[PDB]
Amino acid sequence: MAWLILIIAGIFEVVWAIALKYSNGFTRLIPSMITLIGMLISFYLLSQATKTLPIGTAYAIWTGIGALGAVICGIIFFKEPLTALRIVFMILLLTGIIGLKATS
C-alpha cells in the first residue's frame, strides 16, 4: 500500500512544480498557495511511505515521478519544447538522478 501513496507523493510533487510555474516568481496568489500546500502534502505522504519501504527505492520513484511529470506537464500546459536533443538529454539526466538515489 505504501507504494501507491508514494506514487501520489510524486504526483503532488508534479502538482506544486506546475503550480510554481503558474505563480511567476511566487507573486500570484492561489498558484503560490497550491505550491506550498502541495509541497507539504508531498513531504508528508513521502514520510509515511518511507516508514515501510526502502529509502533508496522510495526516493528514486518519488523524484522520478516528480521530474518526468514536470517535464510532461511542462510541454503540455506551458507548451515547452519537444526537441529530439532535449528529450535525449533529459532522459540522460533523469536516469542519472534515479540511479544515484537508488544506490545510496
Binding site: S23, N24, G25, F26, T27, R28, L29, I30, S32
Partner: protein, 90 residues
C-alpha cells in the same frame, strides 16, 4: 489598469486612515501589496509597508491631523497593472 482597483478611504481619523481596494478576480489575486503614503508636496520621503495579498484593507497610523496625503497601492509586479493612488486630507 488591472489591479488594484477602487482604492478608497473606508474610515478616517485626524491621525489614521482606513483604506481598501478590490483585489480583482481569483486569477488576479496576488501574494502581497506594498503600500505607500506621504505628505503631498512636502519635502519628506514617503513611508512604505507590505500587506499580504489575501487582504483588501489596510490601516495607516501616525499621520499629522490637517495635512493632505497621497496613498498608493502597488502590485508585486507592474506586469498586471499600474499602481493606483488617491489624495486624502486628514
Amino acid at each position: 489598469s488591472s489591479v488594484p482597483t477602487k482604492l478608497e478611504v473606508v474610515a478616517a481619523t485626524p491621525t489614521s486612515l482606513l483604506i481598501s481596494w478590490d483585489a480583482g478576480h481569483w486569477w488576479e489575486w496576488v501574494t502581497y501589496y506594498r503600500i505607500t503614503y506621504g505628505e503631498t508636496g512636502g519635502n519628506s520621503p514617503v513611508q512604505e509597508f507590505t500587506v499580504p495579498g489575501y487582504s483588501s484593507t489596510a490601516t495607516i497610523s501616525g499621520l499629522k491631523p490637517g495635512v493632505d496625503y497621497t496613498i498608493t497601492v502597488y502590485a508585486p509586479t507592474s506586469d498586471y497593472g499600474s499602481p493606483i493612488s488617491i489624495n486624502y486630507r486628514t
